[PDB]
Amino acid sequence: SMSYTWTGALITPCAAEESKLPINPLSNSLLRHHNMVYATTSRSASLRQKKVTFDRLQVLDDHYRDVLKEMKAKASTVKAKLLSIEEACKLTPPHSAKSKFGYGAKDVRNLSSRAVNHIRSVWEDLLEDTETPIDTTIMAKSEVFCVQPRKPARLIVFPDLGVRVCEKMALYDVVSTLPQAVMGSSYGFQYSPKQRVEFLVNTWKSKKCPMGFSYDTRCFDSTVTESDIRVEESIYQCCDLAPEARQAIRSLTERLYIGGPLTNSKGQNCGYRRCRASGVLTTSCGNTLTCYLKATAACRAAKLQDCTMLVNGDDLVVICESAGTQEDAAALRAFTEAMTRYSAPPGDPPQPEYDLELITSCSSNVSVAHDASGKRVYYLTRDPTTPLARAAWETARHTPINSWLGNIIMYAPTLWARMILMTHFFSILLAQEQLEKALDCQIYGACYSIEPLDLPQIIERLHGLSAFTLHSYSPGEINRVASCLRKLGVPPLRTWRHRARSVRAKLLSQGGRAATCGRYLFNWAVRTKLKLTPIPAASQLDLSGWFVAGYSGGDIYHS
Numbered sequence: 001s002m003s004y005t006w007t008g009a010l011i012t013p014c015a016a017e018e019s020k021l022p023i024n025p026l027s028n029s030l031l032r033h034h035n036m037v038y039a040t041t042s043r044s045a046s047l048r049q050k051k052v053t054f055d056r057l058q059v060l061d062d063h064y065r066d067v068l069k070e071m072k073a074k075a076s077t078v079k080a081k082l083l084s085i086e087e088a089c090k091l092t093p094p095h096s097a098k099s100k101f102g103y104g105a106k107d108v109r110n111l112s113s114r115a116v117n118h119i120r121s122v123w124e125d126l127l128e129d130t131e132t133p134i135d136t137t138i139m140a141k142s143e144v145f146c147v148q149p150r151k152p153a154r155l156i157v158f159p160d161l162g163v164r165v166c167e168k169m170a171l172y173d174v175v176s177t178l179p180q181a182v183m184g185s186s187y188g189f190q191y192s193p194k195q196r197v198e199f200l201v202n203t204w205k206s207k208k209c210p211m212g213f214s215y216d217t218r219c220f221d222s223t224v225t226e227s228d229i230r231v232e233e234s235i236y237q238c239c240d241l242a243p244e245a246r247q248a249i250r251s252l253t254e255r256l257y258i259g260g261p262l263t264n265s266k267g268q269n270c271g272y273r274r275c276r277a278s279g280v281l282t283t284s285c286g287n288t289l290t291c292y293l294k295a296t297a298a299c300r301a302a303k304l305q306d307c308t309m310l311v312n313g314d315d316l317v318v319i320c321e322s323a324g325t326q327e328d329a330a331a332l333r334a335f336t337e338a339m340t341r342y343s344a345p346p347g348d349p350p351q352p353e354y355d356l357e358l359i360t361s362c363s364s365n366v367s368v369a370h371d372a373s374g375k376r377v378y379y380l381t382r383d384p385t386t387p388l389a390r391a392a393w394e395t396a397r398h399t400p401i402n403s404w405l406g407n408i409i410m411y412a413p414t415l416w417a418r419m420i421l422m423t424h425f426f427s428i429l430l431a432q433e434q435l436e437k438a439l440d441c442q443i444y445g446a447c448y449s450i451e452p453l454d455l456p457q458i459i460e461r462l463h464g465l466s467a468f469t470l471h472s473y474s475p476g477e478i479n480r481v482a483s484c485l486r487k488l489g490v491p492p493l494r495t496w497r498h499r500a501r502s503v504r505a506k507l508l509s510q511g512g513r514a515a516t517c518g519r520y521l522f523n524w525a526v527r528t529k530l531k532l533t534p535i536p537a538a539s540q541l542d543l544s545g546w547f548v549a550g551y552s553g554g555d556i557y558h559s
């Protein structure tokens with residue numbers, strides 16, 4: 001069937017849309033070619049709709065069915081709990097889109113009567129009505145990128161706030177627990193960056209002759225069929241479940257997940273969806289389960305040997321045993337034809353790699369650096385172009401989410417995050433005296449409230465101590481970074497070093513947590529380095545639940 005059906009009414013914005021980077025002193029000292037940075041808007045929506053609208057092809061075979069059964073068997077060991085109204089309300093982001101029924105995120109979090117009452121009515125309706133399609137809003141996503149030597153806006157689809165609270169009650173424990181039980185070590189969202197690098201490296205070193213590749217499914221969400229969504233539900237139904245939870249999952253699957261009507265911000269009927277909605281609780285879990293099922297079965301069909309998967313929603317990387325250059329090329333092609341039959345056609349044809357570092361998964365690649373003792377240490381990095389563009393954008397315009405904070409945290413060991421992101425943002429936070437003001441950022445889709453002064457502890461936990469002492473980065477990594485800076489008009493690294501020295505001094509002056517940042521975050525700036533020892537508060541702070549599962553589009557806020 002058609003992934004989408006359009007009525008002709010437009011995908012509209014509910015406010016003016018900024019698309020260009022402003023000329024601002026604060027952002028200009030970081031990136032001067034401001035005209036190369038842009039934000040996607042509703043104006044490019046039709047170009048996206050055209051690409052995601054097509055008739056799906058799907059042929060399932062024995063390998064597919066065999067793999068499904070194996071996954072269901074594992075799912076059978078799971079017992080998921082129904083979340084209470086209070087618990088579900090506490091998981092709602094403070095700025096989550098308000099309901100059209102007289103209440104918003106604040107009311108939900110405060111458990112106001114109007115909100116709590118409407119949520120119950122929505123829940124009771126999910127138990128009684130098993131068929132009526134639930135309404136959804138479709139908006140053009142606003143994302144920042146650097147012009148190419150332009151990307152049309154992605155489309156987000158989500159139901160009303162009331163429905164989202166009910167999704168949590170019925171499925172939060174499931175999508176946070178079942179993926180791991182089913183896919184095990186292959187479930188990407190259970191790993192912190194350090195653990196992910198470790199899994200990649202170990203998996204690669206465990207093969208007698210490693211060969212790996214990333215597989216880019218063309219517009220994954222639109223390739224998800226009705227059958228895929230029901231197969232997904234069949235996996236959830238293997239869990240021990242409260243009666244109402246079971247009915248809720250059954251109703252939600254038929255009324256929301258398999259598809260439904262699309263309404264624009266103006267309240268007009270845009271058309272119909274018969275594929276994955278980006279903005280529902282099960283999207284990350286569902287996509288991970290679906291991608292893993294299709295890939296695992298595809299490997300068998302292509303005759304790939306000892307395929308080890310690493311899946312994060314639609315992002316997939318495979319590491320297996322090589323059988324020769326030609327043999328691998330052919331088997332990879334067979335794998336791709338198998339995925340296409342399962343309705344997971346490639347965006348760009350996959351390529352076999354015999355160098356772990358030449359593989360990009362989750363927009364990142366493994367690279368090598370050395371700690372204080374000169375010992376080799378693996379870490380995850382990526383082209384810094386988009387992160388830097390977004391950092392500049394977030395510097396000139398105040399944004400709800402701070403991808404720069406999320407990037408410092410997730411890419412702390414990288415050359416670019418330490419010398420550029422840390423230096424730039426800490427100098428500004430100093431000037432504005434806001435080092436202790438908590439900010440919002442996202443990690444694996446979940447919203448987090450973090451204070452800049454806690455970065456040191458946070459980084460030690462997610463990356464270890466070497467994150468503050470890495471040096472002697474690889475030439476490729478250094479050249480990619482330098483090249484990127486020249487392209488964007490970002491001052492050269494030597495300039496950042498000079499700026500960091502000044503930032504570190506001011507930080508040490510204020511002593512306290514500020515000084516801790518100066519010592520750990522900028523130890524790379526001073527030639528006479530300071531002996532760095534484990535941070536006291538580091539091995540204490542509660543970081544549990546930080547890397548358990550993905551919730552991209554799931555409207556989740558971890559408190």
Ligand SMILES: CC(C)C[C@@]1(C(=O)O)C[C@H](c2cnccn2)[C@H](c2nccs2)N1C(=O)c1ccc(C(C)(C)C)cc1
Nearest residue numbers: 192193196362363364380403406407410442443444445
């Ligand atoms: C600002 C950023 C930190 C937040 C973000 C997310 O909330 O999902 C979006 C980002 C982003 C950036 N550009 C395009 C798309 N998304 C990247 C991604 N999310 C999914 C795939 S890449 N990511 C991560 O959390 C993330 C960062 C590093 C790693 C590792 C180093 C551990 C791989 C893993 C996840």
